Motif scaffolding. Structure first.
Motif, PDB file in Angstrom:
ATOM      1  N   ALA A   1     -44.201  34.193  29.941  1.00 10.64           N
ATOM      2  CA  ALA A   1     -43.881  34.025  31.358  1.00 10.64           C
ATOM      3  C   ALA A   1     -44.576  35.029  32.281  1.00 10.64           C
ATOM      4  O   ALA A   1     -44.600  34.844  33.506  1.00 10.64           O
ATOM      5  N   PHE A   2     -45.108  36.119  31.722  1.00 12.24           N
ATOM      6  CA  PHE A   2     -45.837  37.081  32.552  1.00 12.24           C
ATOM      7  C   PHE A   2     -46.995  36.388  33.265  1.00 12.24           C
ATOM      8  O   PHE A   2     -47.708  35.594  32.655  1.00 12.24           O
ATOM      9  N   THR A   3     -47.227  36.759  34.532  1.00 11.62           N
ATOM     10  CA  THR A   3     -48.326  36.186  35.330  1.00 11.62           C
ATOM     11  C   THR A   3     -49.643  36.931  35.122  1.00 11.62           C
ATOM     12  O   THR A   3     -50.360  37.246  36.064  1.00 11.62           O
ATOM     13  N   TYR A   4     -49.959  37.211  33.863  1.00  8.52           N
ATOM     14  CA  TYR A   4     -51.260  37.721  33.509  1.00  8.52           C
ATOM     15  C   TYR A   4     -52.314  36.669  33.871  1.00  8.52           C
ATOM     16  O   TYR A   4     -52.001  35.462  33.995  1.00  8.52           O
ATOM     17  N   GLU A   5     -53.562  37.107  34.006  1.00 10.92           N
ATOM     18  CA  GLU A   5     -54.685  36.173  34.096  1.00 10.92           C
ATOM     19  C   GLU A   5     -54.807  35.430  32.754  1.00 10.92           C
ATOM     20  O   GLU A   5     -54.893  36.069  31.693  1.00 10.92           O
ATOM     21  N   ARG A   6     -54.784  34.092  32.800  1.00  8.79           N
ATOM     22  CA  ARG A   6     -54.816  33.271  31.579  1.00  8.79           C
ATOM     23  C   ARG A   6     -56.114  32.509  31.299  1.00  8.79           C
ATOM     24  O   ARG A   6     -56.200  31.819  30.259  1.00  8.79           O
ATOM     25  N   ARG A   7     -57.100  32.602  32.193  1.00  8.01           N
ATOM     26  CA  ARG A   7     -58.398  31.939  31.992  1.00  8.01           C
ATOM     27  C   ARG A   7     -59.318  32.859  31.188  1.00  8.01           C
ATOM     28  O   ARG A   7     -59.636  33.971  31.644  1.00  8.01           O
ATOM     29  N   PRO A   8     -59.789  32.397  30.011  1.00  4.61           N
ATOM     30  CA  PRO A   8     -60.704  33.195  29.197  1.00  4.61           C
ATOM     31  C   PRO A   8     -62.010  33.616  29.872  1.00  4.61           C
ATOM     32  O   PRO A   8     -62.642  34.564  29.421  1.00  4.61           O
ATOM     33  N   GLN A   9     -62.380  32.949  30.964  1.00  7.91           N
ATOM     34  CA  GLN A   9     -63.585  33.265  31.724  1.00  7.91           C
ATOM     35  C   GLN A   9     -63.492  34.563  32.540  1.00  7.91           C
ATOM     36  O   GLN A   9     -64.507  35.074  33.016  1.00  7.91           O
ATOM     37  N   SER A  10     -62.275  35.069  32.724  1.00 13.90           N
ATOM     38  CA  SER A  10     -62.054  36.330  33.452  1.00 13.90           C
ATOM     39  C   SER A  10     -61.971  37.514  32.492  1.00 13.90           C
ATOM     40  O   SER A  10     -61.345  37.432  31.424  1.00 13.90           O
ATOM     41  N   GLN A  11     -62.541  38.637  32.928  1.00 17.63           N
ATOM     42  CA  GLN A  11     -62.378  39.913  32.218  1.00 17.63           C
ATOM     43  C   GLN A  11     -60.922  40.356  32.072  1.00 17.63           C
ATOM     44  O   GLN A  11     -60.603  41.104  31.152  1.00 17.63           O
ATOM     45  N   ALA A  12     -60.046  39.926  32.979  1.00 14.72           N
ATOM     46  CA  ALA A  12     -58.609  40.233  32.894  1.00 14.72           C
ATOM     47  C   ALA A  12     -57.793  39.334  31.949  1.00 14.72           C
ATOM     48  O   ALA A  12     -56.580  39.524  31.801  1.00 14.72           O
TER      49      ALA A  12
END
Length: 278
Positions: A176-187
């Motif tokens: 549920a954490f709103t981390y960045e979830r797109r593998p294309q981002s460094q985050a």
């Protein structure tokens, strides 16, 4: 070199009596999680005063956000590192709108004019102010301006690297954490990774470790910009990626970053130390 503490009379800690049984007080990498009742502030004040510790506090006040400086600084005077050396660094586009706030002894304020918006904070701390901070302070604390101090925020937070538990997510499971979830981002952080969701509005550490964090986040944000992607929560997404891969040496509980209008006053919070302005 650390000189001896003087004699002090205080309650004996008892190993068969926990300070707090209702919350996690140490991470699985053996970093304290700072809650009220876990620290004797008299011992900590002694330790940090014996080292003549100087704390830098950085705050960005841009455009209409300059209106928040008066309450921010006046309440910092009441509650932030009182008795220790403090240097405020106020980054603003309007130096003349910085309010004239009366400071306690041993405390100083510098107005730093600023002239990419998303990247500005990480860039300023790691690039523009690098030599300044290393020469002037021992620790850096990076906070948002649209806040007020209501209770003690002191040397209990100081450590090589700290993050703060976001008040909206301290009870959430990691998926549920709103981390960045797109593998294309460094985050990017996958759904099965993550310790905590740290809020970008309150982090800090030694000058060296804060410069390492902000430099890494700035570099990662530049990579994302070159790749045409902006992480879901901007520098907070990158802060979270960094603190996943470089574990903080203390974690602050949500006492240190709270929104009472939004979230009330749960039993688990004995103090509301630093809060959103309504």
């Amino acid at each position: 070199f650390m000189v001896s503490l003087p004699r002090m009379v205080y309650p004996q800690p008892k190993v068969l009596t926990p300070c707090r049984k209702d919350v996690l007080v140490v991470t699985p990498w053996l970093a304290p999680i700072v809650w009220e009742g876990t620290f004797n502030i008299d011992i900590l004040n002694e330790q940090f005063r014996l080292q003549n510790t100087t704390i830098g506090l950085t705050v960005f006040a841009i455009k209409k956000y300059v209106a928040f400086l008066k309450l921010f600084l006046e309440t910092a005077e009441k509650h932030f590192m009182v008795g220790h050396r403090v240097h405020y660094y106020v980054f603003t586009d309007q130096p003349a709108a910085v309010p004239r706030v009366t400071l306690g002894t041993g405390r100083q304020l510098s107005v730093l004019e600023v002239g990419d918006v998303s990247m500005r904070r990480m860039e300023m701390i790691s690039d523009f102010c690098e030599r300044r901070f290393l020469s002037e302070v021992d620790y850096l604390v990076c906070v948002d301006v649209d806040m007020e101090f209501r209770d003690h925020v002191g040397v209990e937070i100081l450590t090589p690297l700290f993050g703060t538990l976001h008040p909206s997510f301290y009870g959430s499971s990691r998926e549920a954490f709103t981390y960045e979830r797109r593998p294309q981002s460094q985050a990017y952080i996958p759904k099965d990774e993550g310790d905590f969701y740290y809020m970008g509005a309150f982090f800090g550490g030694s000058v060296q470790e804060v410069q390492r964090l902000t430099r890494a986040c700035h570099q990662a944000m530049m990579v994302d910009q070159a790749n045409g992607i902006e992480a879901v929560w901007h520098d907070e997404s990158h802060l979270n990626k960094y603190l996943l891969r470089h574990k903080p040496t203390k974690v602050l509980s949500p006492e240190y970053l709270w929104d009472q209008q939004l979230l009330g006053w749960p039993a688990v919070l004995r103090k509301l130390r630093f809060t959103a302005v309504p």
